[PDB]
Amino acid sequence: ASPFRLASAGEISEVQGILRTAGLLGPEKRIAYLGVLDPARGAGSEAEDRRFRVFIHDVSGARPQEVTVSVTNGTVISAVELDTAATGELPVLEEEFEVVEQLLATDERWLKALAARNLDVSKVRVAPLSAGVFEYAEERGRRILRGLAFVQDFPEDSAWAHPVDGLVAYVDVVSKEVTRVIDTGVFPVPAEHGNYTDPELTGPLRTTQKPISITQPEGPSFTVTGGNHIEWEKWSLDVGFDVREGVVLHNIAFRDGDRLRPIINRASIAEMVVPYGDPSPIRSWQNYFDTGEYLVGQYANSLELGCDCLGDITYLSPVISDAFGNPREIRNGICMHEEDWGILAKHSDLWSGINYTRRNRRMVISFFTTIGNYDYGFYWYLYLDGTIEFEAKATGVVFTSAFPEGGSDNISQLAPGLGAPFHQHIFSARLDMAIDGFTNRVEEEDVVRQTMGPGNERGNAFSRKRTVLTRESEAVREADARTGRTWIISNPESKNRLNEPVGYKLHAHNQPTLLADPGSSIARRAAFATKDLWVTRYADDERYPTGDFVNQHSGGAGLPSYIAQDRDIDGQDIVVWHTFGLTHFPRVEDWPIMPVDTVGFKLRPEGFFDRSPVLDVPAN
Amino acid sequence: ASPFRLASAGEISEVQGILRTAGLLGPEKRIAYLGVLDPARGAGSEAEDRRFRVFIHDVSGARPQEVTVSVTNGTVISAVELDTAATGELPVLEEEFEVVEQLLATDERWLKALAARNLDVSKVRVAPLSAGVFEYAEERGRRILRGLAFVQDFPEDSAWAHPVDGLVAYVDVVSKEVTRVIDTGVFPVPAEHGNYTDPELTGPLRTTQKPISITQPEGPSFTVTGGNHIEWEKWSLDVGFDVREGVVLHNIAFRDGDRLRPIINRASIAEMVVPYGDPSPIRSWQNYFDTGEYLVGQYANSLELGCDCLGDITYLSPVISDAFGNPREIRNGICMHEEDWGILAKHSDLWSGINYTRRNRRMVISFFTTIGNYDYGFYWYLYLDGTIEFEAKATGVVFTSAFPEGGSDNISQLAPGLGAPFHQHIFSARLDMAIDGFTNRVEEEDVVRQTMGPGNERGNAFSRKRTVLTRESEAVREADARTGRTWIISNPESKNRLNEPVGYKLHAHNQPTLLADPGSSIARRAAFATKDLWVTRYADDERYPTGDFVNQHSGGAGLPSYIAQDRDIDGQDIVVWHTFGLTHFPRVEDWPIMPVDTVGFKLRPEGFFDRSPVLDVPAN
Numbered sequence A, B: 001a002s003p004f005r006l007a008s009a010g011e012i013s014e015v016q017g018i019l020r021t022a023g024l025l026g027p028e029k030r031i032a033y034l035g036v037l038d039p040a041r042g043a044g045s046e047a048e049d050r051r052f053r054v055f056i057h058d059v060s061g062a063r064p065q066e067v068t069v070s071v072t073n074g075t076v077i078s079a080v081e082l083d084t085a086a087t088g089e090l091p092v093l094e095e096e097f098e099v100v101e102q103l104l105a106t107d108e109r110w111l112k113a114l115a116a117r118n119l120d121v122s123k124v125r126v127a128p129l130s131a132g133v134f135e136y137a138e139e140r141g142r143r144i145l146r147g148l149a150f151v152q153d154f155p156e157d158s159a160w161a162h163p164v165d166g167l168v169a170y171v172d173v174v175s176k177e178v179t180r181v182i183d184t185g186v187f188p189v190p191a192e193h194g195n196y197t198d199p200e201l202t203g204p205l206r207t208t209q210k211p212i213s214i215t216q217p218e219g220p221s222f223t224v225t226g227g228n229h230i231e232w233e234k235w236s237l238d239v240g241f242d243v244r245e246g247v248v249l250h251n252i253a254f255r256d257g258d259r260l261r262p263i264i265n266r267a268s269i270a271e272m273v274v275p276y277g278d279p280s281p282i283r284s285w286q287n288y289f290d291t292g293e294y295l296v297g298q299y300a301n302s303l304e305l306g307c308d309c310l311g312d313i314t315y316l317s318p319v320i321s322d323a324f325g326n327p328r329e330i331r332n333g334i335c336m337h338e339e340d341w342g343i344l345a346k347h348s349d350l351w352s353g354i355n356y357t358r359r360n361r362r363m364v365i366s367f368f369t370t371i372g373n374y375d376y377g378f379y380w381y382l383y384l385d386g387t388i389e390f391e392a393k394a395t396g397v398v399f400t401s402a403f404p405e406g407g408s409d410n411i412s413q414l415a416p417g418l419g420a421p422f423h424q425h426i427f428s429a430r431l432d433m434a435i436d437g438f439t440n441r442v443e444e445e446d447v448v449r450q451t452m453g454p455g456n457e458r459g460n461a462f463s464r465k466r467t468v469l470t471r472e473s474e475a476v477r478e479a480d481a482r483t484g485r486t487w488i489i490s491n492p493e494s495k496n497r498l499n500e501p502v503g504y505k506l507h508a509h510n511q512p513t514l515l516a517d518p519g520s521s522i523a524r525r526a527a528f529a530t531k532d533l534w535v536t537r538y539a540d541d542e543r544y545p546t547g548d549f550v551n552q553h554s555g556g557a558g559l560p561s562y563i564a565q566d567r568d569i570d571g572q573d574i575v576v577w578h579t580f581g582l583t584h585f586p587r588v589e590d591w592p593i594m595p596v597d598t599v600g601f602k603l604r605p606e607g608f609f610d611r612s613p614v615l616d617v618p619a620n
């Protein structure tokens, strides 16, 4: 009966039914996004109203609509026609992916370009890539994808080994017209294959790995009820799933004695962007908002046992809508398991004679998605000691180009003639905080060095300072690793036994933020990515740091517009938005398939508890 | 037959025998340090000469000696009398620990101080703490320990809950005299117990944790030969152990096809210091060089199976000397196991139809040591993909004080009246590099932002720059997290298939370095801790960043003196010294026993290999 339960197949077909009955889902309509809305604040008292939000595209060229449906009541709550030139195009549709290659294959300009390179059109794959917003005035209000070409020598060949540089095309996927074909000159198409299952390249497979077996003879220590409610080692939460954000955690709380204490109301990765740093006009427009433009949840992998997820795994199989409003299950799309995490606490005391050791564990909730060449794992971790962590695991195949004769300041060489343009992968975690409830505030904490002198005659003292962020105008913050900067979210009305406000401290990795010039299109479209930490006052319509419609949408929406309201955040219902990412200068070791690299953040209790919360963990 | 084999009990008793025969180890002599020396450069050609270095203390007050013995040849190579006022006192002896409490228990000043606080002397434990170098001229050339008092209410009580603030004593442990007793005034001795095995404090232990079983039905994938030579998944190394440094890795190399390629010649934690940031005269002298002053290897725990180390564990049991030169085994003092490390690489390709997933693993080599209240785990990790990592796990019981009425800028409150002074734990990793051999150099790599303009019209380009550190005077470097600063160690004479020098990139955590005023005693004694990265030219006598004798030793030795030589490091046999640490403002959650916190660093291949080194890893 939980209002935070996953969407069921039945609910999706019912949204379809309601939209049809209302005249909003005829044969020319396509669902570009569909997801359940979270309950309103204070809704617990009233009965359930399961509401769904839908973006409806029209293949005949009519204006799309944003629609909210009550599936409980069988009604349309609201429907509004969108002006996409103003507020943004709808997310890329799965069905549009094939269209770029298909249209290009009979375009005379494209064919001339392929013929100049002696490339068989039947062997040329075209990546359907988001277009962004640049200088092409004809694209405003049109659904455009840009195409970069890669040669596939045979059906099982990795096309990424054979980029066709110097060539890019722009296509209108609604009118089905090729708008531009740009050919800046021929580059050699790299010839070596990148087939990482071919014995010629791998050599003989290792026979040296002996089995590791991880089992739980009594089953897992967590329970799942109501489909998605998890209880594990004092933690309580609901695991949601949304086609845009992927796995979303709701109602993260910790049972401290007899009281269920909220910590985070909602945690998600609300955006991720991959800006490229190659100034070639073939790629200088490239910025993939995997979450906002493509919808990472839609491409979640079905995860195989003993392969993607090892141990005693409990799976969830979230349901999403296809383009027509029919439910589609992502079988085994979410993994849940607990795992050992080494030593938790240890002391061998000389005076008491007591030797004490306890083991740590973490609950893991994850999914893996594939967006073209990229594959990303999204992992949430809950630890015995109250720590909450996120980790992103980046792998897949690097996006390639030619490697220029004479080298490049913006591209690395992977193989003979084969380049990998420099890029970043930058995430935004949206943390709707509820430290002991909704009345929260954020302080920035810096280490403070002290001068040798009176009060500090030996020059050993050091301290720290905390600055409360009182209003949104003061809440756009940068990292300072040198001063050990962190941010504490506390509840000023909830004190621990030592009369101090309870809190959690956010520890960032302090990786570089968005590198692009601040006057670039990407600095405006991904403004969030220019600063490490933002704090807003909660509002129901402030969901994504880039706004609701990212595809081909200029600046104007998202975090910079939210904070202009300059609202009170000092003891209020607030949301922390943390930017973190990887800056990738690809190495030869990343080719032909990339070993995982990671980035993330964590939050640790900071006077939240009255003493260690793991004193009751048993030995051995 | 390996010259890198662990010291045997037989070798230690033979050093004892040689020293005795030579007249250097009579009844008043005590061994304060004993360890095997590494083979000289180019020694492989010649037959083994196992040499041991020994620091010999004299309990009658005679000058100590530094002695080198050839155990192979049964000879004393060299013996030199030390002037400790100049070059430093010998490491603290285990036998001196009890002496501080014992002497103080019949000192009238100490007894007066305890009586003023109504404390039974039989219940007062005294910590034997390193003294450092301050303003007390009488201490120069004398072996001093300082004592801080903690009340133990009964034999099994945790004394750390009951610090006796406002009181400190200084003791000469050779002449066995109390030099000073300082009483700045009474503070309340905190009364709450910190007994983390007492059911009153823990409450009922959890019954919710179900077993996790980790087994290897065919045994481990690594082999051990010659006692300490490890071969695992293309890696090759020797696991050494030294009473000062603890676990030391030698000859880390990777088998790439048919060639065994060196990476690191020697890896160790060559120092660790814990500076305290409380300006109270009771603690303002407190800086524990756990490695240099106490010898972390000497206090390595015997690690219990399924408790400290989980899985299919192979143990080593290193042998050290006691104070008289008799061998003592640390049973199960080193853990070795491999463990699963999630996904290694993954891609689901739309064009080829090939779905590919591979699992990662790491080899773990660790030990755990206890120094008073502190317990530290030292972990070395080798990954399938060529990554090398170190991690330190800090736990134990926090060092306590009174919490002042009216608060403190330098102490946090843990419990009523109970304080925890702010401090850091700072490590120095000494990495004697051998990237494809000994001809190495280091570059500092920064991300480079680019301005929108000609050549970069869209303002998206970014790049990087590398600066070769050519001489030691230019090789003292600081972190810059904002610019993504790393350091690459390469071999300029060994190129990969793309004609680029092979390399490894060091990724630091960029935590704060030493906070103390640069004119303090600790900034001089722990000068290494003020900068993130140092590079020296290799020399056999440059072992520790603080020199050979740290105890009561001023500046004058260590890294600052080594780099003054301004030697060539551009394509030479070099050593990287990386400073990294934790800055600890204790939280209520750290009490009464601290959950593990971590810090470390890693090195990843950077064009070392000609493509991914894990293409030959099998499925499932």
Ligand code: R9A
Binding pocket: A097, A127, A128, A129, A130, A288, A299, A370, A371, A372, A373, A399, B348, B349, B350, B351, B352, B353, B354, B355
């Ligand atoms: C942003 N960037 C840089 C980017 C760069 C490049 C691309 C891009 O776009 C985003 C892509 C989203 C993630 C990536 C796409 C998201 C998933 C959508 C999906 C699918 C898609 C595309 C396919 C395909 C598929 N299949 Ru498949 N197959 C073949 C050829 C092309 N298939 C589909 C339709 C018709 C025929 C087939 C077919 C025929 C024989 C063998 C395999 N297939 N298929 C069918 C049945 C069972 C299993 C499969 C299967 C299994 C693995 C791979 C392909 N197919 C399943 C699901 C973005």
Ligand code: R9A
Binding pocket: A348, A349, A350, A351, A352, A353, A354, A355, B097, B127, B128, B129, B130, B288, B299, B370, B371, B372, B373, B399
């Ligand atoms: C730098 N800082 C901040 C610092 C702060 C505070 C202290 C300090 O100093 C560094 C300490 C080094 C690590 C810390 C010290 C390094 C280890 C040296 C060791 C031992 C040491 C001190 C003991 C003791 C010991 N024992 Ru234990 N015992 C009792 C009382 C005090 N013992 C030793 C001698 C005589 C009698 C006993 C005895 C009697 C009954 C029960 C237990 N003991 N002992 C004996 C046999 C078997 C097992 C034990 C045993 C097991 C656990 C704890 C104690 N004993 C074993 C090893 C440094």
Ligand SMILES: [Cu+2]
Binding pocket: A394, A423, A424, A425, A584
């Ligand atoms: Cu990347």
Ligand SMILES: [Cu+2]
Binding pocket: B394, B423, B424, B425, B584
């Ligand atoms: Cu600490």
Ligand code: NA
Binding pocket: A265, A432, A433, A434, A438, A440, A538, A572, A573, A574, A575
């Ligand atoms: Na909130």
Ligand code: NA
Binding pocket: B265, B432, B433, B434, B438, B440, B538, B572, B573, B574, B575
């Ligand atoms: Na070297």
